Amino acid sequence: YEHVTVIPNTVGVPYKTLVNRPGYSPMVLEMELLSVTLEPTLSLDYITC
């Protein structure tokens, strides 16, 4: 079963989602972001000193 959800990027705040698959008991999952990193690609132009 493929379950698709969207959560806020706020870190340290858990969110719950309900999975509805007929014929089966409802399932609840909990997701929390512990860390989100944005790593830029850099190219050196020059060194000054």
């Binding site: 079963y1 493929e2 379950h3 698709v4 959800t5 969207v6 959560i7 806020p8 990027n9 706020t10 870190v11 999975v19 698959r21 014929g23 089966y24 008991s25 399932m27 999952l29 997701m31 972001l33 860390s35 989100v36 990193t37 944005l38 790593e39 830029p40 850099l42």
Partner: protein, 49 residues
């Protein structure tokens, strides 16, 4: 002597800045789609519940 405040102190959305490598951490911006493929073994039938 005149560098002023660094990006880790002035950045929007509470972004944490680190070097080596240069990266931004835990910026509270936007949202993040998540898709989970859940195996049938993970499900309990309504007759079992």
């Amino acid at each position: 002597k005149e560098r002023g405040a660094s990006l880790q102190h002035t950045a929007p959305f509470g972004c944490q800045i680190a070097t080596n490598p240069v990266r931004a951490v835990n910026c509270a911006v936007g949202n993040m789609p998540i898709s989970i493929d859940i195996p049938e073994a993970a499900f309990t039938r309504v007759v079992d519940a």
